[PDB]
Amino acid sequence: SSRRKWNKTGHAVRAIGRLSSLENVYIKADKQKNGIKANFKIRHNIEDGGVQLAYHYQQNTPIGDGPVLLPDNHYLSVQSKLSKDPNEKRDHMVLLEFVTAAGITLSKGEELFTGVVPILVELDGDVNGHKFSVSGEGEGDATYGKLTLKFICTTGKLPVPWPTLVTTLVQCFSRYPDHMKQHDFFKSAMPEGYIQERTIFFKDDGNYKTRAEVKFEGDTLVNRIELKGIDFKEDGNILGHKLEYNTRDQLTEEQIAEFKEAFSLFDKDGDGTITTKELGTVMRSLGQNPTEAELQDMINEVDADGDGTIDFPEFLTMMARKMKDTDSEEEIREAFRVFDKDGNGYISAAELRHVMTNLGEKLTDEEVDEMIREADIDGDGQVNYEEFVQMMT
């Protein structure tokens, strides 16, 4: 059938497409410059359709003279969410990002990143002679590869789209798993820092050239940037502001924080990854005693990088994944049965307290009572299955 032929051919051509949209940041050593180089491409959606490609070429070199770590080839995987602050009248961008290194199979500088670190970002820009400045502030938590920042245009209206400045506006906050610690150039250059340079080519339009110094200034990690843009088209997608601001309709920041809180219950040592030991501990606390081999089988089924642990993005993938309605309903049934330890059909305050304390939460009886109250539609002091379903929905 001609329709059969079109389908099978279309699938093949689309498969080529899915394979070659490499979204990752590919890093390799630049031994001559005692640093690293990277290349990657960003796909900016165009309002009302189409994509604007931005080809990135990157080089980093240390600012100071102490030895640094030069890596084997690897990549960073980035998930970014852009949003707006409803009360902010200035031109602005709120950003949440998670970045994790991978691609390799299983000190001083590192130690500076074990907790939450305040960030300042300053950019001075000139695009086609339009001068502008951006200031940003927020925090990074490398344990999770997490960045949270807000940026403001301090010169009025930004003359380019905010998404085009994301990559310019601190790869030292990437999570490198334990087996790749010796490949983390960025933290190895700290505190003295590194210079990051890029050229960014917007296809069929102009380019940005950037130079940044990234370093500690006391206890703050500061990214100070100069940007020059040339050859842009006045009514192209960049100077003409034709790019979409955010992706429809990425899972909410709130939901991410809820998942992070949940993840923390498993990651007992706060190292940003769940091990078989940690998963066993949680399961034991709730009365289930799988063997070490069974725990490893469990983790493997969701361990996308084969490092044998579950990191936060891997946990998010597992939790974000599409379930058939029947399956979602049964998963909620099963969760109810975990809470309802005596199997009588009602979750009591005692039972709730037991589950939360065993997971490792610290709640008073009064806090547990308030949780029951929020769910207890019929006022009997316990949470039945219908009430539980509404709470989880």
Which residues from 300-359 bind a copy of itself, rule CB under 8 A?
Answer: 300-302, 304, 306, 315, 318-319, 322, 324-326, 329-335, 338-339, 355-356, 359
Residue 242 CA to residue 244 CA, distance in Å, equals 7
| The one segment of 42-50, 142-150, 267-275, 324-332 that binds Ca ion by CB under 5 A | 267-275
Residue type, 106: L
Least distance to a copy of itself, CB of residue 62, Å: 26
Indicate the pairing of strand 146-153 with strand 92-102: antiparallel
Could you tell me if 240 and 159 are in contact, meaning their C-beta atoms sit under 8 angstroms apart? no
Q: Which two tokens stand for residue 380?
A: 């009997």
To the question of whether residue 32 is assigned a binding role by annotation, the answer is: no
Residue 124, token pair as written in the block:
């001075």
SS3 327: helix
CB 98, min distance to a copy of itself, A:
17
Q: How far is CA 285 from CA 155, 224, 280, 338, in A?
A: 55, 48, 8, 12
Fill in the per-residue mask, 54 to 73: x = in contact with a copy of itself (CB under 8 A), - = not in contact.
--------------------
Kindly state whether residue 366 participates in binding a copy of itself, applying the rule CB under 8 A: no
- Told to check if 51 binds a copy of itself by CB under 8 A, we report yes
Buried b (16+ CB within 10 A) or exposed e, 173-183: bbbbbeebeeb
CA dist., res. 236 & res. 46, Å (int): 11
In the complex, the smallest distance separating the C-beta of residue 354 from Ca ion, rounded to whole angstroms, is 10
Q: Which stretch binds a copy of itself (CB under 8 A): 12-20, 139-147, 194-202, 226-234?
A: 12-20
Contact between 23 and Ca ion by CB under 5 A: the answer reads no
If one asks whether residue 152 binds a copy of itself (CB under 8 A), the answer comes out as: no
- Establish if 82 lies at the interface with a copy of itself (CB under 8 A): no
The radius of gyration computed from the CA coordinates of the chain, to the nearest angstrom, equals: 24
Distance in angstroms (rounded) separating the CA atoms of residues 155 and 163:
18
Is there binding between residue 204 and a copy of itself (CB under 8 A)?
no
Query: For Ca ion, which residue of 235, 261, 331, 380 counts as binding (CB under 5 A)?
Result: 380
Task: For residues 310 and 295, give the distance between their C-alpha atoms in angstroms, rounded to a whole number.
Answer: 12
Tell me the β-bridge partners of 209.
Answer: 199, 228
Q: Give the binding-site size for a copy of itself (rule: CB under 8 A).
A: 82
Which of Ca ion, a copy of itself, none does residue 342 bind to, with CB < 5 to 8 Å depending on kind?
Ca ion
Sites for a copy of itself among residues 250-279 (CB under 8 A) = 258-259, 261-262, 265-266, 279
Residue 392 binds to a copy of itself (criterion: CB under 8 A): yes
Closer residue to a copy of itself in complex, CB, 82/120:
82
**82 contact choice in a copy of itself, Ca ion, none (CB below 5 to 8 Å, kind-dependent):** none
Q: 231 or 269, CB closer to Ca ion?
A: 269
**Dist. CA 349–CA 370, nearest whole Å:** 9
> In the window 284-323, what residues touch Ca ion (CB under 5 A)?
303, 305, 307
For the chain, how far is it from start to end, CA to CA, in angstroms?
Answer: 45
Contacts of 264 (CB under 8 A, 6+ apart): 270
User: Does residue 50 bind a copy of itself (CB under 8 A)?
Assistant: yes
Q: Residue 276: which residues within 8 A CB-CB, separation 6 or more?
A: 292, 295, 296, 299, 308, 309
Distances (CA, A) of 175 to 74, 84, 141, 186, 266: 13, 26, 9, 11, 18
361 binds, among a copy of itself, Ca ion, none (CB under 5 to 8 A by kind): a copy of itself
Is residue 367 a contact point for Ca ion (CB under 5 A)? no
How would you classify the pairing of strands 310-311 and 273-274?
antiparallel
Binding residues for Ca(2+): 267, 269, 271, 273, 275, 278, 303, 305, 307, 309, 314, 340, 342, 344, 346, 351, 376, 378, 380, 382, 387
The footprint of Ca ion (CB under 5 A) covers: 267, 269, 271, 303, 305, 307, 340, 342, 344, 346, 376, 378, 380
